[PDB]
Amino acid sequence: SNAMDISVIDATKVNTETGLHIGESNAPVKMIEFINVRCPYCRKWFEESEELLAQSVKSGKVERIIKLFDKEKESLQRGNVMHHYIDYSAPEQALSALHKMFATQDEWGNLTLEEVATYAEKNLGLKEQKDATLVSAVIAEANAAHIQFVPTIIIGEYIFDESVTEEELRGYIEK
Structure with missing residues (x-):
């Protein structure tokens, strides 16, 4: 569904500290992923992005910060x-x-x-x-950023979800 209100979400209130870090700590592109592992939309996000993200992480371009959002x-x-x-x-x-x-x-x-x-x-x-503490920190961070739904993926000011195409995702990574 169209749920997010990307205009309500405040991408300045998320951080690259709390959660599961995949990739190099000094990777320039920080990809923040609010997900719940039972969610089929999160499942779609994970499968469709798997190859592009594995390469981006391996090449040192992207660090993923995966925030497991208990819902x-x-x-x-x-x-x-x-x-x-x-x-x-x-x-x-x-x-x-x-x-x-x-x-x-x-x-x-x-x-x-x-x-x-x-x-x-x-x-x-x-x-x-x-x-x-981590569980509560993710819930508190989502709340601060007005993120109610999963998956919510954020790269800088860019806020997207499982509907993203791989071309669009490349676009966001490259700027």
């Missing part, structure tokens, strides 16, 4: 559980985990919250490690 909507609460199995100490492994979570989204996305935890543990081999 209130009943369905997305399943994603919240998964967000707490992310190992922030091992970013490359965390990105791999996000990829597996998205690939299995329909399998765990419709389970009870307790069963999502069991799936993370038994089916994905993950360990619970909620960082309450």
